[PDB]
Amino acid sequence: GCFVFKPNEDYFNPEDSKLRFETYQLIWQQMKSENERLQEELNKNLFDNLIEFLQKSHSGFQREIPTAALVLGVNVTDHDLTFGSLTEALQNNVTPYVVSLQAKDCPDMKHFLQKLISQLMDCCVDIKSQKTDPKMLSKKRTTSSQWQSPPVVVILKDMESFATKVLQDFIIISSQHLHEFPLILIFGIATSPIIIHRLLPHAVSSLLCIELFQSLSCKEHLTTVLDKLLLTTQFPFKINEKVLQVLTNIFLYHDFSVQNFIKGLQLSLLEHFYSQPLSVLCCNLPEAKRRINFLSNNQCENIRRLPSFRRYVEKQASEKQVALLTNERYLKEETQLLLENLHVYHMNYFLVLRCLHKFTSSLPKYPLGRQIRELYCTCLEKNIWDSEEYASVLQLLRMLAKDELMTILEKCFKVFKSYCENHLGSTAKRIEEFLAQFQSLDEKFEVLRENVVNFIDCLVREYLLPPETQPLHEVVYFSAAHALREHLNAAPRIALHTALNNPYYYLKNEANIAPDICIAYKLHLECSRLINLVDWSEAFATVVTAAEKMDTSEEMNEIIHARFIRAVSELELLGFIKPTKQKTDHVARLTW
Amino acid sequence: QQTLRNLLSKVSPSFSAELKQLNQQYEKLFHKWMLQLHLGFNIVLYGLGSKRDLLERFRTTMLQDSIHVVINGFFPGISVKSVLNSITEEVLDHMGTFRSILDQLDWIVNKFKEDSSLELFLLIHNLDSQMLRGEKSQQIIGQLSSLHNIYLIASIDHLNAPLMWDHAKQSLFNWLWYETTTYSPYTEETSYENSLLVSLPLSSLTHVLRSLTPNARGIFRLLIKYQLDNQDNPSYIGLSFQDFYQQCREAFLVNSDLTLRAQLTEFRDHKLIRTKKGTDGVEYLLIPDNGTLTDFLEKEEE
Amino acid sequence: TECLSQVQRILRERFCRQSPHSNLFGVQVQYKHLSELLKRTALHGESNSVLIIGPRGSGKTMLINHALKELMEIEESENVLQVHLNGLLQINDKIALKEITRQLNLENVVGDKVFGSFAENLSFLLEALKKGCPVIFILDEFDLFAHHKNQTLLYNLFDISQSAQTPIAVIGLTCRLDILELLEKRVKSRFSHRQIHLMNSFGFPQYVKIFKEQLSLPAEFPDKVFAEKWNENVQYLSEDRSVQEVLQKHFNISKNLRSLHMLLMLALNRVTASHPFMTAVDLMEASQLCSMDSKANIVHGLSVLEICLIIAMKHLNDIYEEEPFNFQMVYNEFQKFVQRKAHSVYNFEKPVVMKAFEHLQQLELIKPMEREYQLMKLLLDNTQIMNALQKYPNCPTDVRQWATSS
Amino acid sequence: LENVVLCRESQVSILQSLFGERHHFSFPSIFIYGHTASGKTYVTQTLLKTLELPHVFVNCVECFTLRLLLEQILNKLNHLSTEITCETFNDFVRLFKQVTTAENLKDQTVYIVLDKAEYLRDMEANLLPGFLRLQELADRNVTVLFLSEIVWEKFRPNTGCFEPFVLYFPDYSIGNLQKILSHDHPPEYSADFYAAYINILLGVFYTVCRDLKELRHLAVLNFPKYCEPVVKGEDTRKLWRNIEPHLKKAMQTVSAHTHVELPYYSKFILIAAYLASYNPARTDKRFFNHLLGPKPFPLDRLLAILYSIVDSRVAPTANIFSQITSLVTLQLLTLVGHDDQLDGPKYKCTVSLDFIRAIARTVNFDIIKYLYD
Ligand SMILES: Nc1ncnc2c1ncn2[C@@H]1O[C@H](COP(=O)(O)OP(=O)(O)OP(=O)(O)O)[C@@H](O)[C@H]1O
Ligand SMILES: Nc1ncnc2c1ncn2[C@@H]1O[C@H](COP(=O)(O)OP(=O)(O)OP(=O)(O)O)[C@@H](O)[C@H]1O
């Protein structure tokens, strides 16, 4: 029924769309490029052990076949990126004969060999510059007679979803003649190396050489990409703690993946750039000073009339209120230093937030935050010194005053001694202010009183709630949790329950008027054990007999039955009652 | 069916104004779908009422310029072969390969990477049904729609509808999930499926017959003959898989165990073979009457 | 000498290639029934289509080629154009048409159009043959031929044999008994019935004669003294009652007259190095190398962990009978046996015990009907295992006490 | 290649006699069973290498389709050109008559050796009785020499065939396993001493595996470890009693850690799927043998026991259903109604109990009296 019609760009829709959309394209494309680099840097300790292992097991060929079973995590969403990086590294420092098999394009053996030799054929024909089995060996015999006869490796991506028949037959084929064609397969085990015993029976498992590798356990992957992507001063678009709380919850509870997290941040940035007319100036500070100075006056009335600025109006005096209220030429002057104060709060916030992260990660049992993620959460949900948790840190930090605390004051100081002039100008020159406190660390009371002035100065000066403290903070903060959460992760099994039980949209229907289908389901589950058909037709007939008389019986039985059968085919169709075959009839209560 | 459906829409759906208004809430949300679909996402939208007329009003207001392959999924003709066939001829303007589903899948992937700004996007009514889904079937929709140049919109109706998406298969098309309700009765599904008040006739068996290999046609000859030849024995509880494997192997119709198991599960899709577990735990096979099974292969050979 | 290589060359061909030896015994009435039918179908235009059924290994192909040779010897080469088919090779219709094209020398005329109606195809083959004329169709191994998709090269041959009246014999050679009941009803009602043979064996005291007439050096003379010496040695071996003892033992397992060829084939392979006239004990060991127990050689060689596991599976029939078991009940019975025993040599730990299973599955003693603790099936007998555990050469005393407990 | 026999001489000699010289006929087909250890291609390759009977060798492990098994047989045979193509079997018997009409093998009994024929068993129903009659199907002095893992009794087509001559290559006996497990090539010791090492190792070790290949592997490992204290310390009895303390642990040790980090709802999902698989005889009502295995159970029951296990803030989002499908691709849960529909079939548990104990204990939960007792 798939009828095709033949036909025979910057459209976004005040917030004028052309520089809005180029601002979008710049920010999101920048974030994605630095996302891919800070993926590829972390895995270097892992796979540059792998180049050593594959080099050693190739070079000693003068009975065996080498496997390196990777243990990648449970996130199948980002398993393409590590194999892209590993294909790059193995292609550069070892052979340009690297192929990969997907376990969905080869159910049985003919597809396996036909896709493998085609990938090998294009891979050899590019960097030199077919259903047959032994001709693959003849390809390796032709194509590389020289250069230490480089070992062609296959990358099985999923070890798990391969059937055992086709994989067993390939390992016995390849291990049968590896005299010419040395093959070092590397299957990526999704779970743990236990299941390579399960999926391979013992003869084929005895045939090969197993050497396993770890992979980056996933929480200390997303601490790096959360820490680098949003916690920095550098990227112009920050995020609210509630929207971040929604995003980092569905990571750690359901999904356990990072590509879903970057989709979540992508959707937040897009919806922010749609939502509000002050979002256009999400830039670095001179790029903000570019067109704060020239702009439409109704958007500057919007920069007056958004609620956080009108709080700033509420806290200020009349003689500049009368001119800064309406006139553009001064409203630029106060809002420019407000955006500079925004960048100031960000810059003196995040550096000493990292300082407090080191100084609290040093602690035994770590009561405030387990990790660098959740420190953002605890200093924004409740007010931090109001809450009992930083009360517990301050109650902990007194009698912890020993050389462990002084040694880690030295060590935390050293890692933000590298961040002393990587901050490079603090917004209070807090680097040499706090370092001027922190320079008497080499020369037991002094750690206590230095601690006192350090945390009080730090936390009470800048570390506070960003919305109320800072006007014009709408521009960099996007906050809508249960508008986004239903877009990203919805629930149809709760939606049908709500709109079938309580189908009240706005006239009287909340606890008989405006269904047919909710009448059918609600009356089905007024008799809540199971059901047969005819009595259910009489019961539905009874309640719409009530509907007819609260506004001949045989015509009314016909129209009631017709609209009944239109209702009951839907109530089968939508995953409730599943038809009870060969009996006289019934319907079966399949969902309670 | 027909004289029951004469009485349909006689007088009085018991609200009209809020139904026009609750559908008129969603017309403001369309330019968001156009922008959100240009960036590489895919909208699924679920619901309680009929939203396929909303998608039709959507394609009328904003798809007068682009190609759209409106794949209905409610009537029992469509499985993903017809998708790939119709997209290959009536979109790419030349016919494609014929050897296998994966060959035309990889081939129809291959045309889009080289031809920039071709800008085709299909939309699917009722992506979850008895016929559309399946791990052979839904992945071809997935792998097809993963690209930058194909943007599917769907509608899932079922209660257990996101049970057919494991994480890997979910990350082929980037889903974001709208919420919609319309309360309109689903007149196309309820029309073209069935009505109980009046087994499968000859037409869908002709369609499965004409979309499959002649060896699969030779296979169901064997199964329908072993059924018809023992129709009035109440102890005949169906062939096992191994008996059917050896009696299909002796007639050279298929080579391996896995090919016959794949043929069996794709013919278990159409509801013309039912597995029964006996007390062995081995599941024998019997299909849903006898006189309607004589007519085909009476007429399939004179 | 001349004798040993010449006797082994002349006896080995009729012995194990089933070559055409001229003596045929037990089949004189069936052959004589065939010859006049073949002479009147071959000499005149009319076409009658006899059918032959018997067991595997006896009769058929020898009879039809012997009668074919004797009928070919008569001239007016008579232009009977014989067309040998086999059921094994030509599986489908499209191979069958081009195979009839190959046998009948048709590719002088190109005929390069696949026609729709295959009766026109077969009629064209017979038509261009007819203008160019008898055919004799020897359709061997008909039981595989009765599984065509559409039964074309069964049926159109019968329709042409009644309708075209070009000289034809559709001589089917079958092996399974129900050639009629398996044949589909339009063909079987159409023209399957011409007069059906049945083929069987005969009595043992004449079957010792067919041993002597098989084994005796022929009327072909390698060297006539050596033929007299050896065929007299065949008769002297034949009259001895131990050869008659082993031959009666061979009758009651095998009425086949093909098993006799192999049974004697190993004997004559033993003979040429020394003592060219051989013993009854040499025929006894020649029978003895033909095994009785195919599964005792599999079970006799297995190490004793597989032995106490296989007798644990046998013990799993003798309590809680008739389920296809899994690994865990097998492990439980093995552990309760080893905890009945005092010594700790054979309390082998769990991951080794899986290796015995995935080696024993490759011998297909155990059968799969979820991955490694499920529903495994045993296809075996008690008594072969009970015989095998006493013939195990290094069988320990504890697995012997397991066997006696059982 | 070196030693043809290593004392299996009688089976070698009856097979060697049976071939005969070249100009006369031999058997049509010979079937050789045996265990996988027993030299069934070592003996026949070093037998066929000596006389050079002009032969073709195949594994049918390699040839997964019928066309390759015919193609390599014909292509390897015509060397003793282009790929002489055969799509079908009757093409093979046709091109066979032209190929075996050369002076190298016109009279010589060509052997088409077929190895590991149990993989040929499930190729087709045509090819096995089509190959057993090759001596008179094509009539060109052929002998198709089978060898296999599997007994002939299962291998028969159940119509019947040309019954081949069947040899049993014997398993290696105990003193024969002393002799042929490398009594030749000990490099630096006396052969008495390497046989003294392995004569001690074997008699301990002749109850787990009589496979010659892996025992050659284990002996070429634990002999140089045995060797080193003789040539460093210096008396076979003392280091016999030193070598068995290492041999027991090397026996036992020829699987890093069972624990896998999981997202927290998938932990509670497969906790619930275990708890609804292992004691489920409608004992839902109580809380809120074992040996036979996992009983299947429907999805809605799993969802109910999920709600009872977790803190009650769960909603059936798309992610908790999509995760419950995605546990099955990692083979931690299995669907046993294979096609019963997309609507929730029986999902049975397929992880071992120790793994479940660790998954339950890493989120605050002790469950064994809760699981089956
Ligand atoms: N009555 C007989 N006279 C002579 N030889 C016989 C007789 N019966 C059996 N044989 C021998 O037994 C074997 C029979 O082979 P043939 O192919 O003719 O029959 P078959 O083996 O039953 O046919 P198929 O190949 O269909 O099983 C041949 O060795 C033949 O020499
Ligand atoms: N008598 C022997 N002397 C020396 N080595 C032997 C002997 N018998 C077997 N081997 C070993 O066995 C190997 C040959 O394996 P074998 O001949 O057992 O394969 P196979 O029996 O065909 O295998 P399968 O039965 O699994 O197909 C040789 O490489 C050698 O290492």
Amino acid at residue number D127? L
Amino acid at residue number C65? N
For residue C259, CA distances in Å to A544, C24, C205 come to: 86, 16, 17
Q: Answer for the pair D271, D359: CB distance below 8 angstroms, yes or no.
A: yes
Q: Is the CB of D301 under 6 A from ligand 2?
A: no
Amino acid at residue number D197? Y
How many degrees, rounded to 5, is the angle at CA D65 between CA D64 and CA D67? 135
Residue C299 CA, ligand 2 centroid: distance in Å: 19
> From CA D353, how far away is CA D368, in angstroms rounded?
9
Q: Please give the interface size between C and D, counted as residue pairs whose CB atoms are below 8 Å apart.
A: 130
**DSSP letters for B196-264:** TT----HHHHHHHHHTS-HHHHHHHHHHHHHHHTTTT-TT---B-HHHHHHHHHTTTS---HHHHHHHH
Name the neighbours of A, counting chains with at least 3 Cβ pairs within 8 A.
Answer: B, C, D
Domain span including residue C56: 10-197
Nearest CA owner, ligand 1 atom 31: C18
Dmax over CA atoms of chain C, in Å, equals: 91
Q: Which residue has the tokens 């050096």?
A: C217
Angle at which helices A328-361 and A430-437 cross, to 10°: 30
Q: Which residue has the tokens 């309708």?
A: C163
Of C92, C147, C324, the CB nearest to B250: C147
Of the residues D4, D5, D36, D41, which should be mutated to test ligand 2's pocket, given the most ligand atoms within 8 Å of the CB?
A: D41
> From CA B117, how far away is CA B132, in angstroms rounded?
29
Residue D132 phi/psi, 5° resolution?
Answer: -75, -15
Please give the helix or strand (H or E) that residue D165 lies within, else none: strand D165-168
Of B8, B32, B174, the CB nearest to A263: B174
Taking the CA of residue C261 as reference, the ligand 1 atom at the shortest distance is: 29
Amino acid at residue number A163? A
Nearest CA owner, ligand 2 atom 7: D39
Token code pair at residue D202: 């074997």
Residue C257 CA, ligand 1 centroid: distance in Å: 7
> From CA B16, how far away is CA B2, in angstroms rounded?
26
> From CA A535, how far away is CA A543, in angstroms rounded?
12
Q: Is A314 exposed, middle or buried (0-12, 13-18, 19+ CB in 10 A)?
A: exposed
Nearest CA owner, ligand 2 atom 22: D41
Annotated binding residue D37: yes
Residues of chain A neighbouring B102 (CB-CB closer than 8 A): 105, 111
Q: What is residue A388's three-state secondary structure?
A: helix
Amino acid at residue number D262? L
Residue A199 phi/psi, 5° resolution?
Answer: -90, -20
Report the first-to-last Cα separation within chain C, whole angstroms: 60
How many other C-beta atoms can be found within 10 angstroms of the C-beta atom of residue D242? Answer: 13
Antiparallel, parallel or unpaired: β C51-52 and A188-189: unpaired
Tell if the CB–CB gap between B158 and A558 is shorter than 8 Å.
no
> From CA C43, how far away is CA C75, in angstroms rounded?
10
CATH of region B202-299, choose from 1.10.620.20, 1.10.10.10, 1.10.3470.10, 3.30.470.30: 1.10.10.10
> From CA A373, how far away is CA A354, in angstroms rounded?
11
Residue D40 CA, ligand 2 centroid: distance in Å: 6
Q: Which ligand is nearest to the CA of D35?
A: 2
CATH architecture of D9-168: 3-Layer(aba) Sandwich (3.40)
Antiparallel, parallel or unpaired: β D142-145 and D165-168: unpaired
Q: Which resolution, in Å, applies to this structure?
A: 3.8
Residue C175 CA, ligand 1 centroid: distance in Å: 12
Q: Read off the CATH number of the domain in which C166 is found.
A: 3.40.50.300
Tell if the CB–CB gap between D300 and A592 is shorter than 8 Å.
yes
Name the neighbours of D, counting chains with at least 3 Cβ pairs within 8 A.
Answer: A, B, C
Close Cβ partners of C57 (under 8 Å, ≥ 6 residues apart): C256, C257, C258, C259, D160, D163
Q: Answer for the pair C366, C376: CB distance below 8 angstroms, yes or no.
A: yes
Kindly provide the residue ranges of all beta strands, DSSP E only, lying in B31-173, ordered along the sequence.
41-46, 68-71, 123-124
Dmax over CA atoms of chain B, in Å, equals: 67
Residues of chain B neighbouring A516 (CB-CB closer than 8 A): 13-14, 185
Nearest CA owner, ligand 1 atom 21: C57
> From CA C357, how far away is CA C306, in angstroms rounded?
8
Nearest CA among C301, C305, C299 for reference residue C355: C305
Q: Which fold has domain B9-192?
A: Rossmann fold (3.40.50)
Q: B283 pairs with which residues across the strands?
A: B277
Q: Which residue has the tokens 């082998």?
A: C348
Helices (H), A362-429: 372-378, 388-396, 403-415, 420-423
Name the neighbours of C, counting chains with at least 3 Cβ pairs within 8 A.
Answer: A, B, D
> From CA A64, how far away is CA D129, in angstroms rounded?
36
Residues of chain B neighbouring D328 (CB-CB closer than 8 A): 166
Chain breaks in chain C (C to N over 2.5 A) after: 76, 132, 369
For residue B53, CA distances in Å to A3, A503, B156, B183, B188 come to: 16, 21, 15, 12, 11
Q: Which residue has the tokens 């590991």?
A: D116
Close Cβ partners of B16 (under 8 Å, ≥ 6 residues apart): none
Residue D157 CA, ligand 1 centroid: distance in Å: 19
Q: C135 pairs with which residues across the strands?
A: C81
Q: Answer for the pair C31, C25: CB distance below 8 angstroms, yes or no.
A: no
> From CA A5, how far away is CA B60, in angstroms rounded?
12
Q: Is the CB of C61 under 6 A from ligand 1?
A: yes
Q: Answer for the pair C300, C388: CB distance below 8 angstroms, yes or no.
A: yes
> From CA B218, how far away is CA B208, in angstroms rounded?
13
Say which DSSP state B92 is in: T
- Cα dihedral B33/B39/B41/B45 (nearest 10): 0
Token code pair at residue D344: 């929730």
> From CA A557, how far away is CA D295, in angstroms rounded?
48
Tell if the CB–CB gap between C394 and D206 is shorter than 8 Å.
yes
Residue B55 phi/psi, 5° resolution?
Answer: -70, -30
- Interchain contact A198–C (C-beta under 8 A): yes
Nearest CA among D232, D313, D226 for reference residue D268: D313
Give residue limits of the domains in chain B: 9-192, 202-299
Close Cβ partners of B236 (under 8 Å, ≥ 6 residues apart): B230
Say which DSSP state A326 is in: T
Report the first-to-last Cα separation within chain A, whole angstroms: 35
How many other C-beta atoms can be found within 10 angstroms of the C-beta atom of residue C333? Answer: 21
Helices (H), A128-178: 134-143, 164-176
Q: Answer for the pair A54, A68: CB distance below 8 angstroms, yes or no.
A: yes
Q: Is the CB of C199 under 6 A from ligand 1?
A: no
Tell if the CB–CB gap between B252 and C91 is shorter than 8 Å.
yes
> From CA A559, how far away is CA D252, in angstroms rounded?
78
